[PDB]
Design a protein around this nucleic acid. Structure first.
Ligand SMILES: CON(C)Cc1ccc(O)c2c1C[C@H]1C[C@H]3[C@H](N(C)C)C(O)=C(C(N)=O)C(=O)[C@@]3(O)C(O)=C1C2=O
Ligand SMILES: [Mg+2]
Ligand SMILES: [Mg+2]
Ligand SMILES: [Mg+2]
Ligand SMILES: [Mg+2]
Ligand SMILES: [Mg+2]
Ligand SMILES: [Mg+2]
Ligand SMILES: [Mg+2]
Ligand SMILES: [Mg+2]
Ligand SMILES: [Mg+2]
Ligand SMILES: [Mg+2]
Ligand SMILES: [Mg+2]
Ligand SMILES: [Mg+2]
Ligand SMILES: [Zn+2]
Lengths: 214, 64, 155, 98, 60, 122, 134, 84
RNA sequence: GACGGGGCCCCGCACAAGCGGCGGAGCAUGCGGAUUAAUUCGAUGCAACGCGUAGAACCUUACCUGGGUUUGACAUGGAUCGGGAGUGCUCAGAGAUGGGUGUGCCUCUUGGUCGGUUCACAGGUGGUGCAUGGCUGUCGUCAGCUCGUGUCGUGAGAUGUUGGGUUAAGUCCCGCAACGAGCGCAACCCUUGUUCACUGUUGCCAGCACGUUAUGGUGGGGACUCAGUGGAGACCGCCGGGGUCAACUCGGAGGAAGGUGGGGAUGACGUCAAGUCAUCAUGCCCCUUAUGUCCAGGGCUUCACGCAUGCUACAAUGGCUGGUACAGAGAGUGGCGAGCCUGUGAGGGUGAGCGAAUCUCGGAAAGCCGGUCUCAGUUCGGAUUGGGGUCUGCAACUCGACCUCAUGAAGUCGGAGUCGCUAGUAAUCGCAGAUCAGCAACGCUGCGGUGAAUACGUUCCCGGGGCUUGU
């Protein structure tokens, strides 16, 4: 209701932009194609689980990094699904797409995949308290310094809306040098949708671009 | 398991604050061996399982 | 304020006449943030003063300020179900401020055409002992004397 | 002689690219004027924070364009080929004025 | 916005003066920036999420 | 009765005494003075009859002034009324004609506020 | 106690978004700011005192020339920047005989008072729109 | 108003209808939605039903109409007064 | 817990001390009401009302009248007949659309692309913000809100988190059945104030050489300024007093800056079923030859009225006029446009230069100086109204800005009441940008110029904080 997006707040300070290209007469159209690419990938690759889509451009050539928990779905069998998604990408944009798919080392520590899993459980009608506790426990088993999960909506299929949350460890949202990964997802239930937000305090980062990306 | 227990009663207690009411759960547990040692535990938490577990672990140290 | 007495900005001196009084006068005229206009008015008034009398314009301004300086003034008090007018002595800085404010306001209220020698006329009249500023000083002193019975409410 | 204009949004990558260019041309001889920083373009966007009826609370954003300039005093066609063939990060562009 | 309105805005508007912008992600017709398309809300959320290069919060 | 139908006020500069005439403004008076070759910074009470009548002749020859222009303006408004344009209808209604807003003030045409009683809340 | 030293020198002055390049040199004490003289560039005695008084509070007096290049700001800000520049020039020329009095007079200090920025929801830096309950 | 060097704007179908009416007899009512058009002498003495939003109100164009738009004579709002 | 016309202790432009306003006048703008075929919808004490609107003549547009359309204006998938689709010119029409006429797939024997007939289906700014997600206001930059374990009590619960001192701060210090931790405070970030190193164009010009007279125009220069990267710098760190002490506090030195240096970003647990189904998303309900959808015209701009936010004023600290200084921050290729010519001017015609530290917007205005007006409802004010125009646009009637000529309204400083502000602030002065063909922008977000008065103080008014007392 009154809290800033952690990623936007720390943008430029500790975290970095997901798109890296420069253009001053086409800026809008490149933004539009980027929006198309991201919407298409999110709508057609829910099963894989998307941490982030990172877009680069050099000269009429687009490069897409897809950070996914299980790239098995993206690659299909011997890269057949990768080739088909690349082909759909040329069909959508009209440019030369170089697509590479990367793992997430700790999916239980990346907040976006954590929200993915919690929303999936809520859609599959798992008790929200049990789901949140499982995600929290898994995050601290991995070794995050602080978890915070909040599920808002018609939790448990009720009529009134609730805002149930869990947290322990430390999550200093106000600290800019604090490396806080933020994820959000929406569980699509037979009763509207539940908003699941996850903050994960990875640790403290210095400068020079977080040690120039460590 | 090793020690047999019953949850006697659970209650939803609340604390009124400026925003509203801060609800909480209280748990009565009775844990015994079935052969002569028994104890009762009272548990306070925000959640039923946490209150029950706190009550059980508090009752363990009250076996007579 | 609650915290305590806020610091006062030091008063500068007039480059021409070398007196903080004229700087305070121009800063009191000082309408709309036009320092140059205000001190053009003030210098014109002081030069008119030295024209009409041989004495120094800064000295005649000082004499006017002493003739308009109030010694005590009454303030509202909320004791009981009726308001009182408690007389309070006036510190030198406060009374200089009051004299300057009254001088400027009554100069603005004078009937003559231009502000410069409306203020000049008011200054000369006050230095002599006449004018609306001196009348207001006398009236405030008179009302303080009338309400002098509440000098024991001072805190 | 031979202008190189570098423009990006991050001064770290600007500086790294300028250092790479100057060290390349130098590795190919060609003494070259130091990277001089041009004033940064500073675009500002103010946006109503809320989606509805809340105008007094707003959010401000900037798009800072950092620009650096390089002069290649020595013609050095070998450096010409090097500067046309090397690779630069995607965020920064290059403008070569012959 | 309505889909018919979005497609009508996308298509050439007979007369030149009759064209307008529309949020290219959102369809919103009000407060659309020429620099990068989008709109008020779309700009705010995408800048926060970091898909707009060079765009960061300003606190000068 | 100094000029055409108006008396120029004494002790006032000619350049504005001319503007005191209906149909004559600041620039019209300035032109008139430059055409007649008469200074504009001298008071009206020093005005010889020859230059006065030269000024009168120039004004009468070049400019619609006083009764003529007033009748022309009234005729224009009456023509709008009788043709029935939107502007004419607004003129008859005594309401702003040049697309001014009428919801809030329109006061210089609607006159003084004749406040009316309205519905009373509970 | 010593009447300082004459000696050439130079410095820079800044005040309220105005830059003052000052070069003080031995001479008669005349002025030339941006080519034009003092009485031309600072046409009125409103704020000639603020730029002349560094010499008055120093041992040297109006027998010591100065050349000023002034940019940015308004007339008063330029005056303040020029005053600070002259004060700094006298400082770094004679940092022992003029330093104590020159600093005590509050002149080897640059006031950071700059126009505060406008803020959203407010008419000016601090002025607020007229509150209207009901 | 419209620039003089661009000439008056007649909506190019009102013009053709009034010209046809002139050729075949100046006796008919010409129904149009062209409030946008400029009255011209060539249509003087005609009757034109100008749309006003919901009905084609007829105006008989006279000599003095010429310097006006067709829509000036077809009021779009009805007021009649507040209260009654 | 909350509240108290209970106490003690506190804090905030909350008063007080001040300065300038609003409420009166004209206009601009939003809204209520009324009106209307429609005056689309949302916002309603603070925290709705120059708010969604960072741009309503068409469009936008969601509304109204009327004219069209029905797998639909737009998606995705199966079949089925196909080769053009898609378009140029013409005709009819307000247009939608319909009729002409020209042009007419690339592979291949089975694709891209479209067609119908269907079939599935689409579409909805239709309902519900008390079904919701998201986002936001708000109390509130307020100093707080809690947890683990222990302990006390049958229990809710308490302790920590009370007390003494201090702080902007639950900031610390002392004691203490508490010992700890977390979210808030602070700091890390941006900007501004000092300085160093590095670099030197499109920036700068101290010393050197010419330049058309002239312009850092020129070779050149790292000095100065600036540009922008990386450092330094402030920490009650030093000195003295107070403070057992201890936190803190006072004074001083050094210093550009001293006790948080100024400003921004940042809004704890939660409250208001607060706003938003109309940005988007979505549960359920509703519409489906219509609540979809296309088009022209109209409306969102109405006007007996009421409120609100502003602008211009009521003049001489001013008006008019000639001359003459000093900015910052920004924008620009369907763009910014210099120069010259033309016009009273808006502008027009030519038209370099610049994708821009280069070129253009460009003039800064207030101010200073000379002249003039002389207290006049005016040489104040510029509303309204009449004439003649310019530009943008398919098109300025409803309903644009601007120029010019004429006209010259109320207004003499505004009732009860009410608002903002503690310093480069208020007050005023101009400038730029977003949206944008144009613009009703006086709005909004920024930018610099000039530049105050006052704060004894907490008694009173409003909001809030700690503890305690009563219910
Ligand atoms: C009417 O339906 N029943 C009776 C209850 C009701 C049911 C469903 C709703 O969705 C709302 C309401 C009550 C209204 C009251 C609104 C009102 N407001 C419009 C001025 C108001 O007085 C305040 C306020 N000052 O705080 C509110 O709370 C308010 O806005 C609000 O939330 C409301 C709702 O939407
Ligand atoms: Mg448009
Ligand atoms: Mg007060
Ligand atoms: Mg008023
Ligand atoms: Mg409405
Ligand atoms: Mg609705
Ligand atoms: Mg509600
Ligand atoms: Mg709500
Ligand atoms: Mg509502
Ligand atoms: Mg903070
Ligand atoms: Mg809906
Ligand atoms: Mg409206
Ligand atoms: Mg303050
Ligand atoms: Zn949008």
């Amino acid at each position: 209701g009154q809290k800033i997006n952690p990623h936007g707040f720390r943008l430029g300070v500790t975290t970095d932009h997901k798109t890296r290209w420069y253009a001053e007469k086409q800026y809008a159209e490149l933004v539009g194609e980027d929006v198309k690419i991201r919407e298409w990938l999110h709508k057609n690759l829910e099963r894989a689980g998307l941490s982030s889509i990172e877009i680069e451009r050099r000269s009429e050539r687009v490069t897409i990094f897809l950070y996914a928990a299980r790239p098995g779905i993206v690659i299909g069998r011997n890269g057949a699904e990768a080739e088909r998604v690349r082909g759909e990408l040329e069909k959508l944009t009209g440019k030369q797409i170089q697509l590479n798919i990367l793992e997430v080392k700790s999916p239980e520590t990346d907040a976006q995949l954590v929200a993915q899993g919690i929303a999936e459980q809520l859609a599959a009608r798992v008790a929200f308290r049990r789901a949140m506790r499982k995600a929290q426990q898994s995050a601290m088993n991995a070794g995050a310094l602080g978890i915070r999960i909040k599920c808002s909506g018609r939790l448990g299929g009720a009529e009134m809306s609730r805002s149930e949350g869990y947290r322990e460890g430390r999550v200093p949202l106000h600290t800019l040098r604090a490396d806080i990964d933020y994820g959000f997802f929406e569980a699509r239930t037979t009763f509207g949708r539940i908003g699941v937000k996850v903050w994960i305090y990875k640790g403290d980062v210095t400068g020079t671009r977080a040690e120039r990306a460590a | 398991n090793e020690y047999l227990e019953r949850v006697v009663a659970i209650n939803r207690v609340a604390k009124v604050v400026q925003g509203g009411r801060r609800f909480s759960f209280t748990a009565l547990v009775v844990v015994g061996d079935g052969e002569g040692s028994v104890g009762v535990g009272y548990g306070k938490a925000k959640e039923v399982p946490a209150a029950i577990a706190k009550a059980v672990e508090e009752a363990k140290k009250h076996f007579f | 304020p609650r915290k305590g007495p806020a610091p006062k900005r030091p008063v500068m001196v007039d480059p021409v006449y070398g007196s903080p009084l004229v700087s305070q006068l121009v800063s009191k005229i000082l309408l709309d943030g036009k320092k140059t206009v205000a001190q053009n008015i003030v210098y014109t008034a002081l030069e008119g003063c030295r024209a009409k009398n041989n004495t120094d314009p800064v000295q005649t301004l000082k004499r006017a300020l002493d003739n308009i300086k109030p010694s005590l003034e009454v303030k509202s008090r909320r004791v009981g179900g009726a308001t009182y007018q408690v007389p309070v002595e006036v510190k030198p800085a406060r009374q200089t401020t009051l004299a300057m404010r009254w001088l400027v306001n009554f100069s603005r209220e004078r009937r003559e055409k231009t502000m410069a020698e409306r203020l000049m006329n008011e200054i000369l009249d006050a230095s002599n002992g006449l004018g609306a500023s001196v009348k207001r000083r006398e009236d405030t002193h008179k009302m303080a004397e009338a309400n002098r019975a509440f000098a024991h409410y001072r805190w | 002689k031979i202008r190189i204009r570098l423009r990006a949004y991050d001064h770290e990558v600007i500086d790294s690219s300028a250092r790479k260019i100057v060290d390349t041309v130098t590795r190919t001889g060609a003494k070259v004027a130091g990277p001089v920083p041009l004033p940064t373009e500073k675009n500002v966007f103010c946006v109503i924070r809320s989606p509805h009826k809340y105008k007094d609370s707003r959010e401000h954003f900037e798009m800072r364009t950092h620009k650096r300039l390089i002069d290649i005093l020595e013609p050095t066609p070998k450096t010409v080929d090097s500067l046309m063939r090397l690779d630069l990060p995607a965020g920064v562009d290059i403008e070569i004025k012959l | 916005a309505k889909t018919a309105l979005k497609v009508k805005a996308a298509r050439k508007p007979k007369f030149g003066v009759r064209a307008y912008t529309r949020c290219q992600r959102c369809g919103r017709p009000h407060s659309v920036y020429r620099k990068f398309g989008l709109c008020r809300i779309c700009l705010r959320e995408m800048a926060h999420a970091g898909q707009l290069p060079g765009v960061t919060k300003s606190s000068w | 009765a100094r000029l055409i139908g108006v008396d120029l006020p004494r002790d006032k500069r000619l350049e504005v005494a001319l503007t005191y005439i209906y149909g004559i403004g600041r620039t019209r008076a300035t032109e008139t003075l430059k055409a007649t070759g008469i200074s504009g910074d001298l008071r009206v009470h020093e005005l010889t009859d020859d230059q006065l009548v030269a000024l009168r002749d120039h004004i009468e020859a070049n400019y619609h002034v006083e009764g003529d222009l007033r009748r022309e303006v009234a005729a224009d408004i009456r023509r709008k009324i009788e043709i029935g344009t939107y502007q004419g209808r607004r003129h008859r209604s005594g309401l702003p004609v040049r697309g001014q807003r009428t919801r809030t003030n329109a006061r210089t045409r609607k006159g003084k506020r004749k406040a009316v009683a309205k519905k009373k809340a509970k | 106690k010593r009447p300082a030293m004459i000696a050439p020198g130079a410095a820079t002055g800044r005040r309220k978004e105005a830059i003052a390049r000052v070069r003080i040199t031995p001479g008669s004490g005349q002025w030339k700011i941006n080519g034009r003289t003092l009485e031309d560039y600072f046409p009125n005695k409103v704020h000639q005192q603020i730029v002349t008084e560094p010499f008055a509070t120093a041992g040297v007096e109006g027998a010591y020339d100065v050349i000023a290049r002034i940019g940015g700001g308004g007339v008063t800000g330029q005056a303040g920047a020029l005053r600070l520049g002259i004060a700094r020039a006298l400082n770094n020329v004679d940092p022992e005989a003029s330093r104590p009095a020159l600093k005590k007079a509050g002149m080897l200090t640059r006031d950071a008072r700059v126009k505060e920025r406008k803020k959203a929801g407010l008419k000016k830096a601090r002025k607020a729109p007229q509150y209207s309950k009901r | 108003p419209r620039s003089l060097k661009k000439g008056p704007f007649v909506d190019e179908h009102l013009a053709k209808k009034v010209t046809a009416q002139n050729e075949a007899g100046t006796h008919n009512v010409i129904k149009t939605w062209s409030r946008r058009s400029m009255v011209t002498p060539d249509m003087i003495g005609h009757t034109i039903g100008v749309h006003d939003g919901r009905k084609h109100v007829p105006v008989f164009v006279t000599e003095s109409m010429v310097g006006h738009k067709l829509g000036e004579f077809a009021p779009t709002r009805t007021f009649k007064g507040h209260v009654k």
